[PDB]
From a paper:
The known [name] isoforms ([name] and [name]-2) are the product of two different genes. In contrast to [name], [name]-2 expression is typically inducible in response to pro-inflammatory events and growth factors.
In this paper, we report the first three-dimensional crystal structure of [name]-1 along with an extensive structural comparison with known crystal structures of the constitutive ([name]) and inducible ([name]-2) isoforms of the prostaglandin-endoperoxide H synthase. [name]-1 has a very high sequence identity with oCOX-1 (92%) and, like the ovine enzyme, also crystallizes in a hexagonal space group in the presence of lithium chloride and sodium citrate. The [name]-1 crystal shows P 6522 symmetry, and its asymmetric unit contains a single protein molecule. According to the PISA server, the protein in the asymmetric unit interacts with a symmetry-related molecule (symmetry operation y, x, − z-1/3) to form a dimeric biological unit, whose interaction interface is about 26% of the solvent-exposed area of the monomer. Unable to confirm the presence of the heme in our crystal structure, we decided not to include such a prosthetic group in the final model. We delineated two regions characterized by positional deviations between [name]-1 and all the other structures investigated: the α6-α7 loop, comprising residues from 270 to 290, and the region 70–110, covering the first two α-helices of the membrane-binding domain. On the contrary, inter-molecular hydrogen bonds do not involve glycosylation sites in [name]-1, differently from oCOX-1 and [name]-2.
Numbering used by the authors:
A (entry chain A), B (entry chain A): 28 to 584
Write the structure that this text describes.
C-alpha cells in the first residue's frame, strides 16, 4: 500500500541533452555522457563547456548581426570568409540532431527497431510518460485547452497580415511541393508513420515513393518520364497513360487528370505547376545526357538524371529557399566540400517535430489572383484545367507577384485551412510532445519566464495563461506560431533556432553530399555536374518555358 | 557500317579507384576525383600521394611484423600504443569501403535506387560489361574453365590438412552462425538479393529478419524469448509453440523441431548450439535488467537486451574471432571511442564480394567427433536430438577440441560440401565479377605477374594457366582459395588484405558504435553497459551452463 510514487522523469530533471533513466521504483539517473556537463542533473559544467557557455552570444543577438550593416556583409560574401562561415553554420546547426536517430513514436529509448524500421517518424525529445500528474509533465492543468478554441482565438486570421520580407506565393507552393516528399502521414497506420521512406530529398514526389509507381510513371525510352504534350506545351501524362492511383476527385474524366509522383499534387494548380516544371526539367536533362553518352541504356539515363535533379533541389533550397526565409545578408552556399573536414553522417531521418514546425499554412492568402481576375478558394482548389488554361509561364509569373502571409505572431491562418492547425494540436497531443519551454532548452535557449515574454503584448498573454496555467506547460505548436516575431521578420526566434538544425541536417545529410558521391562521374560527366551547380529557380522555369516571366521568391519593389 | 568498336572500359584503364565513364561511342574518361592521382588514367601521383606511395611497406611485410618478435608486442599491449595502433588499423582498413554504397547488382553507377533499395547486395568494383571481347574483360579465353573441373582439381580435399593456427570447430560453427545474419540470398528473387535487410550485426539470426517472426518468437513476458525447458536445461522453443516457418525436414514431429531466428539453423547441431546459447544469454540478461529497472515494460526489456547482445557480438568478434583469425601478437580492442576523431559513417551495406571471400567451407572436417564416438556427415546433418542428447556443455567442449581445416592453398574442401564452391564459381560468373588481379589493385596490392607467384608451386600453376590463359583473367574465388598460404597461417595474403576492410567496416560501422548510441543509458544503466564490455566466449557458454567446459577457438597444446 502506497500512493504510487510519481515518475521522476516527469520533472524533466536532466539538463543539456541528459537522458533520464528510471532506476528502482522512484529514483532516476541522468546519463550526462558527452553532454559536456556532469553532476546528478548534468548541470555542473565541465572545463571546455564553461568557457563556451559564458562566451556564447544570445540567439536573438546573432540574428541581429546577420540582418544589419549590409556593408560588412558585402566584403564577407566576396572573400573566403563566406566559405569559412558556411562551414561554421553547417557544423554547429547539425550537431543538435542525433547522428543515428535516437527515438521514435513507439520507443522512448535507443533500440534497433527505432534504427531499422524506417516507417517511423523519429524524434528528438522523448514523450511525456503516461503516469505523469499533468498531461504536460508536472505543470499546467489536468486538461489541455480546447483544440478549436485555441485555433480560433489565436491562430485564426482576422485580416491578411503580409510577410514583412516579401515572400510570395511562388515560395508557398514550392514549400508545399518540396515538403510533401518526406511529409506523408499514413492514415491507415496512424499519426506517427510515414509512407515517404526516403527520409529526405529523394524527390519521391516526382518519381514516386515506391518502385511500381516509378515504373508506371516512366516512358522507358531515353530515360524520360511519360509526357503528355498539350497544345504545344509539355505537361505530365494523363492518368490512363500512367495508371497509378491519384487522389483526383470523382467524375472528372481521365483525359483531364494528370499522373505525377505524389497522389495529392493534382488537387492544386500550384502543386501541379511544380510537378509540371520538374517533369519538363527531367526530360530536359535526359536530352543533354544522351548527347554526351550515346552508348547509354534507358536505366542509366533515368537514375543519373535523378541525382542531378536531387542536386538542383538541394542547391535551390539552400541558396534561394532558406536564403529568402532567413533574410540574412550573408549569402548561403551549398558546397558539400565544406563538410569534408567534420564528422558528418550523410544520412537523415525525418523527425516528427520537423513536420510540426513546418505548418506554415499562414503562407496561404485570402484569395488567389492569377493576373487579370481573382480566383476564390473553391475556384482554385481541385481545378483540373487552370494549369492548362494558363500554361506554366502565366501561373509562375502570377504566383511570383502576390505576397504571402506572416507565419509568427499568430492570427494569420486563413479559415479555409484552419482545420489543419486543429489536427496539428490534436496530433501533437496524441504524440505527447514535451512543452514548448522544454524544447527551447534542447535547442540552446533559455525557457520563457512569463507569457508576455512569448507573445510580446499583454492581452494575448493574459488569455493564454488562464488557458494553460503555466508557461512551462505551453504546447509546441502555439508557442511556435504565437511567439513574438522579430522586427520585420517572417516568424519568431524559436522558429529559426529549431528549424535551421533540421533543414541543414536534412539537406547536407544526403548521400550525394558525401565525398563518395560528390564526383562529376556521379552525374554523368562535367556537363551534368555543372547542372547541379549554377542551378537557380529562374533556370528551372525559364529554361523549360517558351517565354521567361518574372520568377523569384520576392515581389517587385 | 563499322566493326562495332570495343567498350574502352573493358581494359579497366583507370587506376587507384578511378571511375571509368564512357563518352561518345568509343572514348572513356577516368574520374580521378579525390583518388589521390591525376592524369588520363589516374596514374600520375599527386604530391601527398607520391610521398605515401614511396613509403608504404609491402602488405606481406606488415604481416611479418605482426607475427614475429613477441617481446615487442608485450610492451605495446600494456601501453597506450595499443589504443593508438587500433585507431590506425580501424581507420586505414575502413577507408577502402565506400562511405555510402556505390553500386549494386543492377547498377554500375551511383544511383538513388542503389542507395535506397536495401534489398540489393552492394559491390566495390563494377561488373564486366556485356560487350567485352572475353567474359573477364579483354584477357583470357572465350569460355571460362569448367565449374566442376575447377572445384574438383583444385578445391576438392584429398586428405585433411589441419589449420596451422589451431582453429577449432567451435570457431567454424560460430562463423557459420554469425554470418547467416547478413548472408541470406533469396532463391526466389535471384543471386544478388538478400533477405537480411539489417546489413550488419543486427542479430537477425536470433530475433528474426522481419517483425512478424520476431513477435512469434517472443514470450511477451519480461521481454524474454519463448523458451522450452527440457530435462532441466533451457532450449529454444518447439515449432508449435513459436509457429514461424522453419526449414526442418519433413516427418520429424514438432515436439523435436526448435524455432529460432534463422530458418536453416535447425539443420546442424552446431548452428542449433549457438542459437541455444544466445537464447540462454538473452533470457539471462532480461533477469539482470528487471532487477535494476522494475518499472519497465515488456518492450524495453527486449529492445535494450537486443543492443546488449549486439554489443557482446561485436566485442567477441573483434577481440576473439578476428584475433584468432589474424594470429597477430597485437591484441585487438573493440573501443568505439577510438573512431570518435575520424569521419566514420556508422552505417554498413553488405557487399557481394564479402559474401564471396567468406566461403571458408574448408573449415569443416572429415567427420565430427563428439567426445567418445565419431559421427559421420550423414549422422551429424539434420540431427534433431544431438543437441538435447548431449546438452550445451558437451557439444561446446567437443567442438573446442577438434582442429578445423586450412582455408588457403586449396585442396582442403570436404567433398560433402564441394557443391557449394561450384555454386560460388557459377554465382561469381552470373554477377560478372572482375578478375582476381583487378581486385588486388583495388585493395592496395600489385597484380600477380605469373601463376607461380600465386599458388607457390610449379605444377598447380601449370594447369591453372592452360585453363584460364592469363593471370589477369583469373576469377575471384580460385585466386583467393588457391593463393599460397603465409608460413603457418590459415589463408594467403589476399584473404587478409580484402577481408579485413569489410569486417572492421561492418563491425564498427554499427550505430551502437556511434557517439549517439555508445552511452550507458542505451544499455539500461552501467550494469548493462558493462555486459557489453568484458564479454568473452567463455562468459557466453559458462555463464549459461551448469558446468564450465573447455571453450575457446584453439585446441589445447
Ligand atoms: C535535479 O532536478 C530535480 C528536478 O528539477 C530537482 O528537483 C528535485 O526533485 C526531487 C525528485 O526526486 C525532489 O525530491 C526534490 O525535492 C526536488 N528539489 C527541489 C529543490 O525542488 C533537484 O533539486 C535537482 N537536483 C540538484 C542537486 O540540483
Ligand atoms: C477552374 O479554372 C478555370 C480557369 O482556369 C475556370 O474557368 C474560367 O472561369 C472564369 C470565371 O472567373 C471565366 O471568366 C473563364 O472564362 C473560365 N475559363 C474557362 C476556360 O473555363 C473554372 O471556372 C474553374 N473551375 C472551378 C470549379 O472553379
Ligand atoms: C591508359 O590506359 C589504357 C588501358 O590500359 C592504356 O592502353 C591504351 O588503350 C587505348 C584504348 O583507347 C589504345 O588505343 C592504346 O593503344 C593503348 N595503349 C597502349 C600503350 O597499349 C593507355 O595507354 C593508357 N594511357 C596512358 C597515357 O598511359
Ligand atoms: C542423431 O544423433 C543421435 C545422438 O546424438 C544418434 O543416436 C545415437 O547413435 C549412436 C550411434 O553412433 C548410438 O550409439 C547411440 O545410442 C544413439 N543415441 C540415441 C539417444 O539415439 C542418432 O543416430 C543420430 N541420427 C542420425 C540420423 O544419424
Amino acid at each position: 500500500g502506497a500512493p504510487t510514487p510519481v515518475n521522476p522523469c516527469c520533472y524533466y530533471p536532466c539538463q543539456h541533452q541528459g537522458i533520464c533513466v528510471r532506476f528502482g521504483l522512484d529514483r532516476y539517473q541522468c546519463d550526462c555522457t558527452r553532454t559536456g556537463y556532469s553532476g546528478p542533473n548534468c548541470t555542473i559544467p565541465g572545463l571546455w563547456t564553461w568557457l563556451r557557455n559564458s562566451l556564447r552570444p544570445s540567439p536573438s543577438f546573432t540574428h541581429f548581426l546577420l540582418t544589419h550593416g549590409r556593408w560588412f556583409w558585402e566584403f564577407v560574401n566576396a572573400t573566403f570568409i563566406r566559405e569559412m562561415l558556411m562551414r561554421l553554420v553547417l557544423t554547429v546547426r547539425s550537431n543538435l540532431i542525433p547522428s543515428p536517430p535516437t527515438y521514435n513514436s513507439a520507443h522512448d529509448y535507443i533500440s534497433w527497431e527505432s534504427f531499422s524500421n524506417v516507417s517511423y517518424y523519429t524524434r528528438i525529445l522523448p514523450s511525456v510518460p503516461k503516469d505523469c500528474p499533468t498531461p504536460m509533465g508536472t505543470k499546467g492543468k489536468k486538461q489541455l485547452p480546447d483544440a478549436q478554441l485555441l485555433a480560433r482565438r489565436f491562430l485564426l486570421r482576422r485580416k491578411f497580415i503580409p510577410d514583412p520580407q516579401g515572400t510570395n506565393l511562388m515560395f508557398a507552393f514550392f514549400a508545399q511541393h518540396f515538403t510533401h516528399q518526406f511529409f506523408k502521414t499514413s492514415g491507415k497506420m496512424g499519426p506517427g508513420f510515414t509512407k515517404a521512406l526516403g527520409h529526405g530529398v529523394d524527390l519521391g514526389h516526382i518519381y514516386g515513393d515506391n518502385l511500381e509507381r516509378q515504373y508506371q510513371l516512366r516512358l522507358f525510352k531515353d530515360g524520360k518520364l511519360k509526357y503528355q504534350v498539350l497544345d504545344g506545351e509539355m505537361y505530365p501524362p494523363s492518368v490512363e497513360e500512367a495508371p497509378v492511383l491519384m487522389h483526383y476527385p470523382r467524375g472528372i474524366p481521365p483525359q483531364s487528370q494528370m499522373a505525377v509522383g505524389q497522389e495529392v499534387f493534382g488537387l492544386l494548380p500550384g502543386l501541379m505547376l511544380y510537378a509540371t516544371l520538374w517533369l519538363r526539367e527531367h526530360n530536359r536533362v535526359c536530352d543533354l545526357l544522351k548527347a554526351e553518352h550515346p552508348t547509354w541504356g534507358d536505366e542509366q539515363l533515368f537514375q543519373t538524371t535523378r541525382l542531378i535533379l536531387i542536386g538542383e533541389t538541394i542547391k535551390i533550397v539552400i541558396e534561394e529557399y532558406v536564403q529568402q526565409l532567413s533574410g540574412y545578408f550573408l549569402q548561403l552556399k551549398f558546397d558539400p566540400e565544406l563538410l569534408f573536414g567534420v564528422q558528418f553522417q550523410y544520412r537523415n531521418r525525418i523527425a516528427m517535430e520537423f513536420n510540426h514546425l513546418y505548418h506554415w499554412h499562414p503562407l496561404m492568402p485570402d484569395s488567389f489572383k492569377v493576373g487579370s481576375q481573382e480566383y476564390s478558394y473553391e475556384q482554385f482548389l481541385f481545378n483540373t484545367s487552370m494549369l492548362v488554361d494558363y500554361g506554366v509561364e502565366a501561373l509562375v509569373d502570377a504566383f511570383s507577384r502576390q505576397i504571402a502571409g506572416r507565419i509568427g505572431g499568430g492570427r494569420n491562418m486563413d479559415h479555409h485551412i484552419l482545420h489543419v492547425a486543429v489536427d496539428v494540436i490534436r496530433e501533437s497531443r496524441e504524440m505527447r510532445l514535451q512543452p514548448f519551454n522544454e524544447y527551447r532548452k534542447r535547442f540552446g535557449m533559455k525557457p520563457y519566464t512569463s507569457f508576455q515574454e512569448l507573445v510580446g503584448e499583454k492581452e494575448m498573454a493574459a488569455e493564454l495563461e488562464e488557458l494553460y496555467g503555466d508557461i512551462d506547460a505551453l504546447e509546441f505548436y502555439p508557442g511556435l506560431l504565437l511567439e513574438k516575431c522579430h522586427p520585420n521578420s517572417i516568424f519568431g526566434e524559436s522558429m529559426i533556432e529549431i528549424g535551421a538544425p533540421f533543414s541543414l541536417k536534412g539537406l547536407l545529410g544526403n548521400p550525394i553530399c558525401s565525398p563518395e558521391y560528390w564526383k562529376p562521374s556521379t552525374f554523368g560527366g562535367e556537363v551534368g555536374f555543372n547542372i547541379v551547380k549554377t542551378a537557380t529557380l529562374k533556370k528551372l522555369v525559364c529554361l523549360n518555358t517558351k517565354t521567361c516571366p518574372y520568377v523569384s521568391f520576392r515581389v517587385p519593389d
